[PDB]
Amino acid sequence: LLSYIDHEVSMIEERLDDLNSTMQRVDFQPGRYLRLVAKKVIHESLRTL
């Protein structure tokens, strides 16, 4: 439960960084561009377990 989930989350974060790295080249409305961000949330039955 600890190792597998945490490793998967870390890999997902690294991959997301890699994805948002290349977004900056393409130009949105002049003087603007887009960036994707993620936040971590823990809830539900996990605590109970």
């Binding site: 989930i5 998967e8 989350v9 997902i12 994805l19 290349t22 977004m23 080249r25 393409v26 130009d27 949105f28 409305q29 002049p30 003087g31 603007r32 561009y33 887009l34 960036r35 994707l36 961000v37 993620a38 936040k39 971590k40 949330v41 823990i42």
Partner: protein, 132 residues
């Protein structure tokens, strides 16, 4: 993958400033939804190909249906500019609504026709068509 939350943000070119944060495409006008959806989808597709594990794409092509059904001219220009900047190849499918921009940014055209219940397909460059 269900232990995260995602959001998009618009950041000005010079400097680094949050200008607008979004979790979707709600409350927008007609053209805004189309441009946002096309931009995010094409960026995700470009990543999803070979450059996912780096290197250049091996299968580069993308099909758009009913292109520019609700936007104006400038929005279409931005769309084409971004699509070419991403480095792919596009095929367009439109009714006779707009053809100037297509003539400006394409090289070959296909004309379909129906007469009864059959169909006829013709292909031609623009130079030959101009002489008629």
């Amino acid at each position: 993958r269900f232990r995260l939350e995602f959001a998009v943000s618009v950041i000005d070119r010079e400097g680094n400033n949050l200008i607008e944060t979004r979790t979707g495409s709600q409350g927008g006008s007609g053209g805004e939804k189309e441009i946002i959806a096309s931009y995010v989808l094409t960026a995700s597709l470009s990543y999803a190909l070979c450059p996912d594990g780096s290197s250049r794409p091996l299968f580069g092509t993308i099909v758009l249906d009913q292109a520019f059904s609700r936007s104006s001219h400038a929005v279409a220009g931005r769309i084409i500019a971004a699509l070419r900047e991403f480095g792919l190849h596009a095929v367009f499918i439109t009714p006779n609504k707009e053809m100037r921009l297509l003539r400006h940014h394409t090289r070959s055209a296909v004309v379909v026709h129906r007469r009864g219940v059959e169909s006829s397909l013709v292909s031609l460059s623009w130079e030959a068509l101009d002489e008629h």
